[PDB]
Paper text:
ZER1 and ZYG11B, the substrate receptors of the Cullin 2-RING E3 ubiquitin ligase (CRL2), recognize N-terminal (Nt) glycine degrons and participate in the Nt-myristoylation quality control through the Gly/N-degron pathway. Furthermore, we present the crystal structures of ZER1 and ZYG11B bound to various small Nt-residues and uncover the molecular mechanism of non-acetylated substrate recognition by ZER1 and ZYG11B. In conclusion, we propose that ZER1/ZYG11B not only targets Gly/N-degrons for proteasomal degradation, but it also has the ability to bind a defined selection of non-Ac/N-degrons by a conserved molecular mechanism of substrate recognition and target their degradation through the non-Ac/N-degron pathway.
To understand the molecular basis of ZER1/ZYG11B-mediated binding of non-Gly Nt-residue peptides, we determined the crystal structures of ZER1 bound to either SFLH-, AFLH- or TFLH-peptide, as well as the crystal structures of ZYG11B bound to either SFLH-, AFLH- or CFLH- peptide. In line with our SPOT-array results, ZER1 binds to XFLHVGQD peptides in which X is either Ser (KD of 1.3), Ala (KD of 1.6), Thr (KD of 3.1) or Cys (KD of 3.9) more potently than to the Gly-starting peptide (KD of 4.2). Intriguingly, unlike ZER1, ZYG11B was unable to bind to Nt-Thr, although they adopt similar structural architectures. Furthermore, the carbonyl oxygen of the Nt-residue is stabilized by two hydrogen bonds from Asn597 and Trp552 in ZER1 (Asp 567 and Trp522 in ZYG11B). Besides, a strong π-π interaction was formed between the aromatic side chain of F2 and the indole ring of Trp 552 in ZER1 (Trp 522 in ZYG11B), this observation is consistent with our SPOT-array results that ZER1 and ZYG11B prefer an aromatic residue at position 2.
Numbering used by the authors:
A (entry chain B): 516 to 689, 691 to 759
B (entry chain D): 516 to 621, 625 to 650, 654 to 690, 692 to 756
Write the structure that this text describes.
């Protein structure tokens, strides 16, 4: 049982604003950000109100006053990944300042890979909408497309993680041909998470039908071959799990 | 995606204590309890740390010190429902004062006493031996609660899976079955588009058929089960 009402995000952002004007990144502020992160999971209404209650400004301002608060950035970027998974709200993330900050966080060594992983997930969900939808001119899409490839092979594929998935469907919709690097990030996420937490994620992956889509990714000629390697690798880890 | 680590639980009972000692139930405290409620969903470890961080004591003290901040009671009883779904931890809720306040609270719609009836149905699933008020005294009071509630009342509750109430659909306590079936029927009578997919999902229809063919089952529970199945087909 649970409950997420929209007043809750508002109160969390008010407390965050206060602890920002107190220049205090205390446990309670990382806590407010983690609470927004949890509350937004697969619930578009709360991402919408986070956007409407000056959420991006508080994000950037806590980036600015606490440049080396690793777990804060982790929580903020998990929240923003959740926000990026609602595509009709993704237009509000298509400004050169938002995309600049996202791409500049592809190299954050904060909490391992979490900040870079979440920034790259946000940008992958932003790329799934197609090449038409970035009417920003700078930064440029192929510039941080390449930067995303660099981030994805930066990460150790046996890295332990500070993240949890209740469903893989948001990643399993990134089965298309419009953006290969989104697709590659999806395959990487699956590979890492069942390589390091098999007992946890190969049941979830089989359950939601990830194997037919990974097989289809190996069976499409348009698919870039390193994604096909990583998909064959996820398939083999999950098949060894079932066996 | 999400992540709630167990340390977060600590912070809320930390913060609650402050504004329990100043007796100020501001929006942030009703949130503190709502956050504990959310962190407890299908996560036994964080209910463990709520219990081990004298959670029951602040439950009692926030019950009495803020007697009619309904949504505070809402959140607290939802939290306690989440902790009651864990079999390991139900022994710590069997003191006669804990059961006292639970059945005695058998509110913003049904929420408080719906949650009281969920906690008590989950403890009764464990059998008459594991009940060391008296058990069929609170059996009549739980039947009474289920016959109070409007079955098409609007709610402020959320279920991501029906699995906790689908394992109470069993013969050790027929009132488990009655409360679970009532829950399913209210929410699929009223929020079908969200919850009848959830019920098909985990294979509820064969179990409801089995409830219609169960000798231990009371005939109004088979009543509601058969009406649930046909609503699900509708």
């Amino acid at each position: 049982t649970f409950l997420h009402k929209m007043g809750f995000v508002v109160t969390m952002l008010k407390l965050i604003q206060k602890k920002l004007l107190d220049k205090t990144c205390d446990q309670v502020m990382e806590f407010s950000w983690s609470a927004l992160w949890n509350i937004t999971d697969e619930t578009p209404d709360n991402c919408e109100m986070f956007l409407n209650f000056n959420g991006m400004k508080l994000f950037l301002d806590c980036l600015k006053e606490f440049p080396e608060k690793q777990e804060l950035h982790r929580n903020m970027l998990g929240l923003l990944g959740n926000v990026a998974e609602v595509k009709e709200l993704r237009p509000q993330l298509m400004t050169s300042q938002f995309i600049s900050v996202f791409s500049n966080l592809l190299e954050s060594k904060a909490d391992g890979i979490e900040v870079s992983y979440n920034a790259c997930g946000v940008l992958s969900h932003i790329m799934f909408d197609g090449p038409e939808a970035w009417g920003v001119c700078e930064p440029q899409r192929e510039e941080v497309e390449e930067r995303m490839w660099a981030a994805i092979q930066s990460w150790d594929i046996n890295s332990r993680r500070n993240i949890n998935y209740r469903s893989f469907e948001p990643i399993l919709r990134l089965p298309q041909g419009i953006s290969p690097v989104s697709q590659h990030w999806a395959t990487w996420a699956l590979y890492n998470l069942v390589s390091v937490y098999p007992d946890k994620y190969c049941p979830l992956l089989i359950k939601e039908g990830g194997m037919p889509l990974l097989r289809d990714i190996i069976k499409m000629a348009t698919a870039r071959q390193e994604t096909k390697e990583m998909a064959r690798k996820v398939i083999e880890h999950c098949s060894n799990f079932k066996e």
